Ligand binder design. Structure first.
Ligand SMILES: CCCCCCCCCCCCCCCCCC(=O)OC[C@H](COP(=O)([O-])OCC(O)COP(=O)([O-])OC[C@@H](COC(=O)CCCCCCCCCCCCCCCCC)OC(=O)CCCCCCCCCCCCCCCCC)OC(=O)CCCCCCCCCCCCCCCCC
Ligand code: SF4
Ligand code: SF4
Ligand SMILES: [Zn+2]
Lengths: 386, 112, 97, 115, 176, 125, 48, 96, 208, 29
């Protein structure tokens, strides 16, 4: 008989409320059975009882490490259904904060992966940088993480009068912190022993199982949604896409580090190219007017009242909108029946498919290797369970 | 000649021209058993004939890869095997027959 | 920053880099916590003339999906969903890490 | 006619056969469940509860509905055997903290407005 | 446009082989990692002396809710119920009637702070700047009931925090 | 393969609704009346199914409105009354149907406001 | 204040030993700061 | 404008005080009852009526964009004063 | 029409229309309808019996090559006789395109499991079964994935109440967590927001 | 007649930001 073991939910390596039922012969893993749903909150039904603006803060709490990226995907879906266009300055702000968010997510992923493996130190070095980016979030929206800044019309508020300078000051020091992380990990023989040839997935298998993002790029597949299906102003920035060679945990780690560097590159470009103008679509039947207009003009007051009580109506139709979120392809299948409430909202999270493939990726490995594989899949269970 | 296809689990092919010719001949042979008026047969025959002509006319592997637009001839071989398997399946399925059933009148009506 | 120069030398030697050049604590180069007021430019629809809403109504230009091949109702060259993707180029900046 | 597609059974006889098989499996499982979960019920109570749950759906006359009921019962059995379930889940069948709600007219009239 | 992260081949000359043998036998990269940690030991820690020292915040910061007044001392809230309609958590409960002088005022104004997501949508929706999220964040309670705010509690919060709330609004209202 | 089932459709044992909320419930199938405060008729196009109102009481703390009825908020939208009836029948709910009420066509005439001998003449305008 | 400290350690409060009625020689907390000094201390503004 | 009930409980601006036989008063024993002491109806009743030399006046609550939406108040009735429906301020024309 | 209105792309619209015609001609046995949405999103309505052939053709055909399944979900429309609408989203990397395939079913009719065509579907079909109660035939390991152990009913169905039928609490007499009929201190407040005036003339339905 | 004031990059541009990996050799033979 194989030993049957509960891995989580109350486990440090679990990375959330995961009940990994594991069959083991000695420490060899014979079978992985991920039991999820310990963080299923019934988000999609709730979204059905809300208006389109009331449903936005749910996308903050889907993947709690990539908040604005989740907001951007939902906003793109709703804007596509509304047949409107965000203004250019809003799109530049969106891309800038999406890259800052990608930095946040990649720091969290790499350091928690190292912490599982046993290298506890880089976490503390990188979480101070995460703290400074949380400060950027807070200055723009008043919240450290669940900002709700990106709205289906653009962004809620314009940047405060000295934010770009501080973002520049942060961005010109971050590369040295990445360098210190790489000094700790990249050439360590212990880290390579714990990561090289662990959780190897082929290109064909990665495509069929539904993988996306780094889980594809580590296996040599050349696919990045920002390059192939660009959104906002991603076609106007220059960056390279890291590609792996072996499909293992080590290659995925290198891809994420290089991705962090390329995000610094994109941020530098966005800082030097931010244009002037308004921040939300100049269409008061979709985006609320300014407060001075709301307090002086009859139409502005009527539209403020109606947008905050009933909300805008969205013409009937269904869309599937996908973005390159820091964890992979993040999608929304949004169905509108013509009213101000969404009829259906299905959320596609890359972690769902990655966790469904965890059992495949752990064949012939031990317990510690399974811990490394869970770390390398970059799983947050808010997006998996919803 | 070439090392490292670059995709994990995709081995480098020695003698890819012969493999491609064999696969395309098998594909045409399987398509020969489908009714001639079926759209699948004529479309697949047309594309297969173009690819086979391209393979026959270009002895150079990199130039052939650039002509085929199929991404690294090992992938072209894999796609040919996929098409052969699909051709056998379509022979068994016969999707050229008339529509099996008509849906209810308001089944695809939206909104509501 | 503020520390002894011998400790700075030991730090630089152990880390291998000049630490002082890129300090991770923000000493005084960040923006002031009080700023002048902004002015914020208005949008393109803030015109007083030639601004009828029916000419800038994006919601009302959406239409039901276009129907191709309802079942209830020449060589014909084969076709694909979109032209094949061009192969990627290898990063003239830094092709190999 | 009525032009329906089956799940597993073509008539009520095959559906009844599957029901009997699932009942046999639950009957065999009950003592192991009582041992593993350290339940304070008897095996007789557990088998009585299994019979009561089976008889809750005795009025069904559609083979497809019966097939779905057997599929759900097999899902529950698989869940119980593998210990995915906890003692709270098993004990949820017995409603031990639910005060008995009366069924006669007068008591209902006394307590409130609901029929 | 792409780059490779692990497609580099190692040199096979005798010098390179001897350097790699020295790396294997004398553990050079491990000493590099030790040097990095030793370097961090001599830096100044990024820790702050809480509660004496506080983390930086912004005028846009979302915290505990408050109900404000006009300078005359009259309440700003007119019971339009836009905050109650917009609240995604349904955390706001409002009941209103004509006041003794005929004014349109609330008789019940509750916020369930354990329902609230602190999104700030209500202060955006308020047309008279009556409901705000003030700057306070240190209001942990020992019981659940203390976090069910009624109108008296919110008016008291407004009275207690008005000096800072008005200064925060003055610094941010031109971005709104 | 088809098996020719002969019985009426019935899915109650699969829905998981407690039997109390299947047998003692009454649904109303109706086209909602136009709100008399407005003239728009767009809310009078579809059929609605809604459940009977149950007890609501006052919360001892805060005085909120408490309920023990899980179906107190459920409203279903249907294209036609037949669809609503079929749904209620297959779910096992007793239903009451009301025929759709439409406003009758009215003969309007502006000139009647100025009748030579008729009572219709307006005393003001 | 001490502007030569890094951001975060450049402003601080030494709390009173005797608040409204309670002894605060040891028992202090961040809620004892009044709102105006709260605005200055959390760096919402530069002006005391 | 605070005032106590015959039970010694403060009466709020709303006017709600628990009745003598109401058990819910037990929630305040060993604790206190939250009552805001600045009654808005009394504070607005102290403001002086503004005299303006026009039939129609405008009010925005002061502060421009920091007040309420701007409204126009007619001041033709001389038996009463024009009251803002947002702020509660009163206006009149110079009379007698 | 310029600054605030989303721009159009007629080239992609034409390409998707032609490819939809292509797919319909190749598989007349199953394809019932083909649509191209205004924002260039190809949709193909089919018969349920053709779930496995269509997808197989779409993932295997040289001119198709949709080797990746973005996601698979279901929509509940109670007014339809076939309640549930099964939606497959597919991505082609070779041709950088997306396609949506839709079919229908009701409560008692199984759909063929497509795990063989796509390995990714496993958990998607389990999720559809859990949330909507749609059985998938020949599924490797079909069981609940999102809901609690022993949970009765399917939450995503339109008829199911938002707060469900039971809640949980710890009971000290039995010393364990128990499930009881839901009681709410504050009832969810239902809002009626729909405006009585029509918003979009282009979608007006005939007056029957 | 006040002019538009808005958070923008300074005239010309911000100073260049390093992003490439910097791992020195740092050893003997
Ligand atoms: C044996 C080695 C001990 C040497 C030592 O303690 O200080 C080294 C001292 C530390 O320098 P640093 O802190 O990196 O430089 C910035 C100062 O901290 C910046 O100076 P500061 O303004 O923070 O100075 C505060 C002052 C006062 O701070 C204290 O009160 C700390 C006393 C607690 C220690 C008990 O620090 C001290 O005088 C305590 C130093 C050692 C006390 C133990 O530098 C040296 O004198 C060289 C020491 C040998 C180098 C190896
Ligand atoms: S902050 Fe958000 S959740 Fe809280 S009361 Fe205001 S609107 Fe509701
Ligand atoms: S707080 Fe503001 S939005 Fe809420 S009811 Fe009062 S006036 Fe209306
Ligand atoms: Zn006023």
């Amino acid at each position: 008989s194989n030993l049957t073991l509960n891995f989580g939910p109350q486990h440090p390596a679990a990375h959330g409320v995961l009940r990994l039922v594991m069959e083991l012969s000695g420490e060899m893993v014979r079978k992985c059975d991920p039991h999820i749903g310990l963080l299923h909150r019934g988000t999609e039904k709730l979204i059905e009882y809300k208006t389109y603006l009331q449903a936005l803060p749910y996308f903050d709490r889907l993947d709690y490490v990539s908040m604005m990226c989740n907001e951007q995907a939902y906003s793109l879906a709703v804007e596509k259904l509304l047949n409107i266009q965000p203004p250019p300055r809003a799109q530049w702000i969106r891309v800038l904060f999406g890259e800052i968010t990608r930095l946040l997510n990649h720091i969290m992923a790499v350091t928690t992966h190292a912490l599982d493996i046993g290298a506890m130190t880089p976490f503390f070095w990188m979480f101070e940088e995460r703290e400074k980016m949380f400060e950027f979030y807070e200055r723009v929206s008043g919240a450290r993480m669940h900002a709700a800044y990106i709205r289906p019309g653009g962004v809620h508020q314009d940047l405060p009068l000295g934010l770009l300078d501080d973002i520049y000051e942060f961005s010109k020091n971050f590369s040295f912190r990445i360098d210190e992380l790489e000094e700790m990990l990249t050439n360590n023989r212990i880290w390579r022993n714990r990561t090289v040839d662990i959780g190897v997935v082929t290109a064909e298998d990665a495509l069929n199982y539904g993988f996306s993002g780094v889980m594809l790029r580590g296996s040599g597949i050349q696919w990045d949604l920002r390059k192939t299906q660009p959104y906002d102003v991603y076609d106007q920035v220059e960056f390279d896409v890291p590609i792996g060679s072996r499909g293992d945990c080590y290659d995925r780690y290198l891809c994420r580090v290089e991705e962090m560097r390329q995000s610094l590159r994109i941020i530098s470009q966005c800082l030097n190219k931010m244009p002037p103008g308004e921040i939300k679509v100049d269409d008061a039947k979709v985006s609320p007017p300014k407060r001075a207009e709301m307090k002086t003009s009859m139409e502005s007051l009527i539209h403020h009242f109606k947008l905050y009580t009933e909300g805008y109506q969205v013409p009937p139709g269904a869309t599937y909108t996908a973005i390159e979120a820091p964890k992979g392809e993040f999608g929304v299948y949004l169905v509108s029946d013509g009213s101000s409430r969404p009829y259906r909202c299905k959320i596609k999270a890359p972690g769902f498919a990655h966790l469904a493939g965890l059992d495949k990726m752990s064949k012939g490995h031990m317990l510690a290797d399974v811990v490394a594989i869970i770390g390398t899949q970059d799983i947050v269970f808010g997006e998996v369970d919803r | 000649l070439k090392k490292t296809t670059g995709l994990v689990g995709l081995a480098v092919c020695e003698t890819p021209h012969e493999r491609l010719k064999i696969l395309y001949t098998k594909i045409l042979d399987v398509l020969g058993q489908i009714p001639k008026n079926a759209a699948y047969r004529k479309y697949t025959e047309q594309i297969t004939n173009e690819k086979l002509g391209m393979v026959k006319a270009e002895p150079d592997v990199k130039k052939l890869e650039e002509q085929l637009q199929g991404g690294q001839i090992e992938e072209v071989i894999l796609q040919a095997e996929n098409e052969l398997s699909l051709a056998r399946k379509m022979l068994r399925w016969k999707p050229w027959e008339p529509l099996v059933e008509e849906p209810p009148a308001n089944q695809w009506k939206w909104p509501i | 920053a503020s520390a002894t120069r011998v400790i700075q030398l030991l730090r630089n030697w152990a880390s291998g880099r000049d630490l002082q050049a890129k300090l991770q604590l923000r000493y005084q180069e960040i923006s002031k916590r009080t700023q002048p007021p902004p002015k914020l430019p208005v949008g393109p629809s803030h015109k007083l003339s030639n601004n009828y809403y029916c000419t800038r109504d994006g919601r009302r230009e959406a239409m039901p999906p276009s129907i191709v091949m309802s079942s209830q109702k020449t060589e014909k060259k084969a076709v694909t969903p979109a032209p094949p993707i061009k192969r990627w180029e290898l990063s003239k900046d830094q092709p190999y890490l | 006619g009525t032009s329906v597609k089956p799940i597993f059974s073509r008539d009520m006889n095959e559906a009844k056969r599957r029901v009997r098989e699932l009942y046999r499996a639950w009957y065999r499982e009950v003592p192991n469940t009582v041992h593993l979960f350290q339940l304070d019920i008897s095996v007789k109570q557990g088998r009585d509860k299994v019979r009561e749950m089976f008889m809750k759906n005795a009025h069904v006359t559609d083979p497809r509905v019966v097939d779905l009921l057997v599929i759900k019962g097999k899902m529950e059995l698989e869940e119980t055997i593998n210990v995915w379930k906890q003692r709270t889940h098993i004990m949820r069948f017995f409603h031990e903290t639910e005060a008995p709600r009366p069924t006669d007219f007068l008591s209902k009239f006394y307590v409130g407005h609901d029929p | 446009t792409y780059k490779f992260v692990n497609m580099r081949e190692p040199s096979m000359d005798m010098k390179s082989v001897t350097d790699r043998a020295a790396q294997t036998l004398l553990w050079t990269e491990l000493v590099r990692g030790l040097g990095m940690t030793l370097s961090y030991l001599f830096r100044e820690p990024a820790t702050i002396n809480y509660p004496f020292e506080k983390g930086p915040l912004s005028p846009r910061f979302r915290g505990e809710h408050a109900l404000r007044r006009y300078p005359s001392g009259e309440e700003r809230c007119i019971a339009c119920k836009l905050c109650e309609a917009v609240c995604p958590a349904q955390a706001i409960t409002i009941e209103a009637e004509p006041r003794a002088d005929g004014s349109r005022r609330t008789t019940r104004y509750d916020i369930d702070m354990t329902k609230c997501i602190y999104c700030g949508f209500c202060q955006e929706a308020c047309p008279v700047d009556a409901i705000v999220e003030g700057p306070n964040f240190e209001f942990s309670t020992e019981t659940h009931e203390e976090l069910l705010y009624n109108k008296e509690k919110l008016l008291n919060n407004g009275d207690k925090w008005e000096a800072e709330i008005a200064a925060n609004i003055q610094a941010d209202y031109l971005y709104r | 393969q088809l098996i020719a089932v002969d019985e009426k459709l019935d899915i109650t044992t699969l829905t998981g609704v407690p039997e109390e909320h299947i047998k003692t419930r009454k649904v109303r199938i109706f086209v909602p009346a136009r709100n008399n405060m407005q003239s728009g008729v767009n809310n009078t196009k579809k059929w609605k199914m809604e459940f009977d109102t149950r007890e609501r009481w006052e919360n001892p703390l805060m005085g909120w409105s408490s309920t023990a009825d899980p179906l107190s908020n459920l409203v279903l939208t249907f294209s036609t009354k037949e669809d609503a009836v079929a749904f209620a029948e297959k779910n096992g709910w007793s239903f009451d149907v009301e025929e759709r009420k439409v406003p009758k066509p009215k003969s309007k005439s502006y000139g009647a406001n100025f009748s030579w001998n008729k009572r219709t003449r307006v005393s003001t305008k | 204040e001490d502007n030569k400290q890094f951001f975060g350690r450049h402003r601080w409060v030494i709390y009173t030993t005797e608040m409204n009625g309670r002894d605060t020689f040891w028992d202090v907390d961040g809620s004892m700061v009044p709102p105006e000094w709260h605005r200055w201390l959390h760096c919402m503004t530069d002006d005391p | 404008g605070v005032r106590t009930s015959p039970t010694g409980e403060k009466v709020t601006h709303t006017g709600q005080a628990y009745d003598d036989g109401d058990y819910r008063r037990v929630r305040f024993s060993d604790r206190q009852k939250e009552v805001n002491e600045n009654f808005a109806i009394d504070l607005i009743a102290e403001q002086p009526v503004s005299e303006v030399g026009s039939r129609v006046i405008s009010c925005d609550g002061g502060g421009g964009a920091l007040g309420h939406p701007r409204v126009y108040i007619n001041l033709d009735k001389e038996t009463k004063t024009g009251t803002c429906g947002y702020c509660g301020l009163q206006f009149r024309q110079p009379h007698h | 029409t310029r600054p605030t209105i989303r721009p159009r792309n007629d080239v992609v619209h034409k390409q998707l229309s032609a490819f939809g015609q292509y797919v319909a001609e190749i598989l007349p046995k199953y394809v019932q309808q083909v649509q191209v949405s205004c924002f260039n999103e190809l949709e193909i309505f089919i018969h349920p019996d053709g779930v496995i052939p269509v997808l197989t053709f779409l993932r295997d055909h040289t001119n198709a090559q949709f080797k990746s399944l973005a996601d698979l979900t279901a929509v509940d429309v109670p007014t339809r006789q076939n309640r549930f609408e099964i939606v497959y989203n597919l991505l082609s990397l070779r041709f950088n395109s997306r396609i949506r395939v839709k079919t229908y079913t009701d409560e008692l009719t199984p759909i063929e499991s497509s795990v063989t065509v796509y390995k990714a579907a496993n958990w998607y079909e389990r999720e559809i079964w859990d949330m909507f109660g749609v059985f998938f035939a020949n599924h490797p390991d079909l069981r609940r994935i999102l809901t609690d152990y022993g949970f009765e009913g399917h939450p995503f169905r339109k008829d199911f109440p938002l707060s469900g039928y039971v809640e949980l609490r710890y009971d000290d007499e039995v010393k364990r967590v128990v499930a009881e009929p839901v009681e709410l201190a504050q009832e969810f407040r239902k809002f009626d927001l729909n405006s009585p005036w029509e918003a979009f003339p282009a979608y007006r339905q005939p007056p029957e | 007649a006040s002019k538009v004031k808005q958070d923008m990059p300074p005239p010309g541009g911000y100073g260049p930001i390093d992003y490439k990996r910097n791992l020195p050799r740092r050893g003997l033979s």
